[PDB]
Each structure stands twice: as C-alpha cells, then as structure tokens.
Design a protein around this ligand. Structure first.
Ligand code: HEM
Ligand code: HEM
Ligand SMILES: O=C(NO)c1ccccc1
Ligand SMILES: O=C(NO)c1ccccc1
Ligand SMILES: [Ca+2]
Ligand SMILES: [Ca+2]
Ligand SMILES: [Ca+2]
Ligand SMILES: [Ca+2]
Lengths: 307, 307
C-alpha cells in the first residue's frame, strides 16, 4: 500500500493539531525538543524503515535500539512522544500508529522551528520488535568519510547526493556533545594536531567549550549562527569551514565532495531551494520500507508491543 | 492508616506471584535486575517516602527524579516495573499502587537472590508529582563521611545504627561504576595517594578494572566474594578493608565507627542475625511517610499521574 497524506483525514482529522499542541507546550520548558524529535524520526527510518522500532523498551525477547551506539545517552524526547500518543488515543482510539505519529511530530517540529510546512504521507504501521544490531550497523557515525556517508544513505535507499546534503541540514538546530568532536580539536587522525578543515578562530571557541580534561557530555550548538531556528545557515557555516562535526564539514571540504559542493553553495544562498529539497528528501526518507495494510500493528503504547 | 501485609489478601491475592514471576523471567536475561529493583525502592523511600515518585517521567509541571544526581545514568529497571504493573492491572484492575508494587518487587528480588523471605506491609498509594530537588538533597553520596551517612538516614526517620549498617548490606550484590571510586584509587582527599583504608592487593585489582584514562562507566562488582548472591559476605569484606565504596568501608574503618563496628562483626559472622536485622530495617524504611487512605492515587501507568 502507498502512503498518503490523507490517511487520517476521515479517521482522525485532528491528529496534526494534537501533535502540534503537545510540542508547542513542551518547547516552553525545553527549547531543544523540536531538534530531538526530528532526530528520533531519522534514527527510526534508518533501521528497518520508519516503523517506530526505536520507541520500544527492552524486553526478554529483544534488546532496545535505545542502547545502540548513537542512541545511548544521546537520543531523547521519549516521554514527550508518550504524551501525544495518549492524547491521540483519547481522541482516536487505536487509530494512529506510533510510526506515523513520530513522522508528523518530526514535520511539526521543523515547521515550529521556522522551517517549511507540508503534509507528510501517512499509513505506516508499527513493528513487533526492535533491531539493536541493525541500528549499530545502519546509523552513520560522525567519523565517517564522505564516501562512507554516501554508502550509509544508499544502503537504505537514499542514493542521491541531494538526499545526503539536504537531510544533513537537520544540523541547522540542536546540540552535540563535546565527546564527538574532541579529535577534531586536539588530535585528528592520530596526527596530534587538530582538523585542518576547522576554522582556527572557531577552533579556539570550541576548545574553550570542550577543554582537554573537561566534561565530554557538555553540549555545543550544531549551528553557531541560529542555534534554534530551522534555516539554511548550516550551509553558510560549511563554506566558512565552521561545520561542527567531521561529517558536516566533509560535505564541503572532502576530496570526494565534487558533487556535494554545488548543492551546499546552492542551499547556502537560497532558503526556498533548501526547503524544497529538504521536504523532498524527508518524504523519501519517510518512505523507507514501511509496514502497511495488515503488516505490523497500531501500538496502543509506543513502548510495548500489543498483547 | 497503618500499613499491613494483608492489604491485598482479598482484593488481589496473587499480586506477589505475578511480581515474582516477572523477575524470575527477567533474571534469565539480566542477572543484575534483582539488585537494580531493590535500589529503586530505596531511592523511592528516601525522597518523600515510598510513594513511587521516582517512577514518574518528566512533565511540564515537574521534573523527574530520574535526572537526580545518583539516579541519572545509574538507576535502571523501569521497563521491568512497567511489565509487572501491566500484568497486575490485568488481574486486578486499579487495585495495586506502584508504590506497593515496587515494595513487593524489592522484597522478592532479595528473596530470589538468596536472601530472607518475608511479607511486606502494604497499603501505600502513589504521589501526584516527583521531587527532583528533594532527591538531590536526600540521597546519600558515596563520598559522605560516617556522621554524614548517619545524618542522611536520621533525616528520613531511620535514626538507629542498625538501620544504616543493615540496609548498607544491600551492597552484597549489584554493580558500581568506576567513576565513583576513582578518587580512592588514585587521589584520595586531594592527597595524590589512594585511600589508606583500601586493601593494597585489592587496590591493584581495582586499578586494573578502572584505569586512570579508562571508561568511567565500566562496572565493578559491589561484593567481590559472591557478586550476585544476597548474603552476609558484604560485611566480611569490610573487615578485610575490601569495601568497594568509601561509604562502605567507613562503617568499619571510620574514627566515628564506634557503634557500627560491633554490628559489622556480628553481621559478618551470623547470617540469621543479619537477615533478621535487614528485614526489620527494610520494613522501617518502607514505612517512611507513606500516602494512605484517600491520599495520592492508584496509578494506572506508573510513569504518569492519572487524568
Ligand atoms: C549524515 C550523518 C549524520 C551524522 C554522522 C550525525 C551525527 C550526529 C551527532 C554526533 C549528533 C550529536 C549527538 C549527541 O551529542 O548526543 C547529532 C545530533 C543531531 N542530528 Fe545528526 N547526524 C547525521 C544525520 C542527521 C540527519 C539526516 C538528521 C535529520 C534530518 C539529523 C538531525 C540531528 C539533530 C536535530 C540533532 C540534535 C539532536 C538534539 O539536540 O537532541 N542528523 N547528529
Ligand atoms: C549508605 C549510603 C549509600 C550510598 C552512598 C550508596 C551508593 C551507591 C553507589 C555509588 C552505587 C553505584 C551506582 C552506579 O554505579 O551507577 C550503588 C549501587 C547499589 N546500591 Fe547503594 N548506596 C547506599 C545505600 C544503599 C541501600 C540502603 C541500598 C538498599 C538496601 C542500596 C542498594 C544498592 C544496590 C543493590 C546497588 C546496585 C544497583 C545495580 O547494580 O543496578 N544502596 N549504591
Ligand atoms: O547521530 C548518529 N547517527 O546518525 C550518531 C551519533 C554519535 C555516534 C554514532 C552515530
Ligand atoms: O546511590 C546513591 N545514593 O543512594 C548515589 C550514587 C552516586 C552518587 C550519588 C548518590
Ligand atoms: Ca525503525
Ligand atoms: Ca539554524
Ligand atoms: Ca518517593
Ligand atoms: Ca553477596
């Protein structure tokens, strides 16, 4: 079955508003939640498709993806997801899947942060288990080279350069722990020297935030220009060699960036072009091997499989 | 209202078995769960009493105690608690509180680990909010001195030396992160030397497990003799200066341990005496300012307050 943005127009016409309202309230106490939610959706889709497998808690039959390298002590916002599911179950019992809920939540998060507004295709159903080992192999790491980042995306069906460049624009807001950039700051590639593609003045600022013997869990803004606004500033930073993580800067400075540089230049100089591309890439990501029809179920509680 | 072990004998006579069955199944995949659960009960009781406040997830009206120093990236087993609550709600809808469930789970965990078996007083109800700031002040820290550990316990009503010594016997099983003993190993009290009350041969073993530049999250066994069995070996270790954390060894080596040494000697040489004392101390802890009668509620989902 093909996903359609009209899937709940009859069964639960107000699911979008309920989702938006929940995030709006949460943003008041946690300005970072919008970024956290968009990330949860991405990590859901890259492991067996957008099937809400990442939302399952540990059981005796399978381990949670929340323990995966990249998720463990990093991914957050789960209780917030619980809140909107409860509110939706009240208005539309056993109607909206967690997989779709997380998808709408990601879109609303982007819009609420100043990004584009669009209707996401719906109709996905929830998985009956979690895939930890798969998550440990499918999620891209910040130390990956450009070709490696390309392989990671192609591995799940996003084989276009625009997919990688556009979706990476998700780093236009949100935070990153010092631990993931320590090497770029003090000893890159076993050279004992910092990453040469990192702007020197910016290097001083980062070293101040992430000292050699400091807290590795200390958080830094992904986008130094507009830390909480979803815009195209992420690309301007790359042109100035101010991409925070290795995977960010490689989009512009890697020797294999022949095909990505033009997209960065384009996105850095046109919000419309970037927004159009981001929406297209997002819908493509949301279409990775979804469970539909009678496959999977409509979870009542996103943390556990239905009895 | 006074707590009574017969509280559910009519309303939900099989709650004990349902709780035991859940832990037995979990132990198969996670041998540490018994220790984790007993600890969750202790951290519940020390903050506003055993009211299941520690089980509440973050909300926009109050912050979760799961973020407290001592709980954050340390406390675990929450999904397991979710599992037994679901099973109990199926057999006895809206009957057993999370506060009581966590209490029975703690007792069964001790028994299943080889400890004593007894009927816990019941009748507690669930809180309507969590107390993070209170948790940050009420939970004892591993770097506390003997008098400080005594003040911490007296602060919640456990003003007897036996309470401190007996309950500390909970370290007869379970794990501890390297981060909490690094100072005893390499630089105790700003002296640049290890803790003199730590056995030197054991110090070598620990330094091997917790290297100066190693993983601070690496886990070490609390009891080097019988790491997973609930017995009195914890006290024998203290006599040999092999207590893992500072608060452990101080029970035997502190200059203020005049009143605790005799209890340690006694408990180290008689399982019966220790078990009797542990059960008495546990029931006293389980009686810290409970919510009863019409106070609080019977939570349907331990993570959230009833609508
Ligand atoms: C190209 C490969 C990617 C890599 C290697 C990567 C790596 C990372 C790293 C290291 C962090 C910080 C984690 C932490 O400090 O706990 C992070 C955060 C984030 N990423 Fe990515 N990421 C990638 C792609 C994406 C994509 C495609 C999106 C979504 C469109 C995304 C959205 C986010 C957001 C919004 C945050 C901040 C989350 C928060 O603050 O809670 N990332 N990413
Ligand atoms: C006297 C003050 C106490 C201090 C300062 C203290 C401190 C600690 C520390 C540092 C850990 C390791 C945490 C980690 O590595 O994440 C721990 C674990 C543990 N504690 Fe205590 N504790 C105390 C009292 C108690 C009491 C009274 C009980 C319950 C009767 C208890 C039961 C446990 C258990 C079973 C574990 C292991 C948990 C697991 O492996 O998941 N503790 N404690
Ligand atoms: O966000 C990640 N992958 O998308 C990630 C984060 C840190 C370590 C490994 C992977
Ligand atoms: O277990 C604790 N308190 O009981 C604890 C653990 C580490 C740091 C602070 C407190
Ligand atoms: Ca998934
Ligand atoms: Ca931005
Ligand atoms: Ca409590
Ligand atoms: Ca033992």
């Amino acid at each position: 079955m093909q996903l359609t943005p009209t899937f709940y127009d009859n069964s639960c016409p107000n699911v979008s508003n309920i989702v938006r309202d929940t995030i709006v309230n949460e943003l008041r106490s946690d300005p970072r939640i919008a970024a956290s939610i968009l990330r949860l959706h991405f990590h859901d889709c890259f492991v067996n498709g957008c099937d809400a497998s990442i939302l399952l808690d540990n059981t005796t039959s399978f381990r949670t993806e929340k323990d995966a390298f990249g998720n463990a002590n990093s991914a957050r916002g789960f209780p917030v997801i619980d809140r909107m599911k409860a509110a939706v179950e009240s208005a539309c019992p056993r109607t909206v899947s967690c997989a779709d809920l997380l998808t709408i939540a990601a879109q609303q998060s982007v819009t609420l942060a100043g990004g584009p507004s669009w209707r996401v295709p719906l109709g996905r159903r929830d998985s009956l288990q979690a895939f930890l080992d798969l998550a440990n192999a499918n999620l891209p790491a910040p130390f990956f080279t450009l070709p490696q980042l390309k392989d990671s995306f192609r591995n799940v069906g996003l084989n276009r350069s625009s997919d990688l460049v556009a979706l990476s624009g998700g780093h236009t807001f949100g935070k990153n722990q010092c631990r993931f950039i320590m090497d770029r700051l003090y000893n890159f590639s076993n050279t004992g020297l910092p990453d040469p593609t990192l702007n020197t003045t910016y290097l001083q600022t980062l070293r101040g935030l992430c000292p050699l013997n400091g807290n590795l869990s200390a958080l830094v803004d992904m986008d130094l220009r507009t830390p909480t606004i979803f815009d195209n500033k992420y690309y301007v930073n790359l042109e100035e060699q101010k991409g925070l993580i290795q995977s960010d800067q490689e989009l512009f400075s890697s020797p294999n960036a022949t095909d990505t540089i033009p997209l960065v230049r384009s996105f850095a100089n046109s919000t419309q072009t970037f927004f159009n591309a981001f929406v297209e890439a997002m819908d493509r990501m949301g279409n990775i091997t979804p469970l539909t029809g009678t496959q999977g179920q409509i979870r009542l509680n996103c943390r556990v499989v239905n009895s």
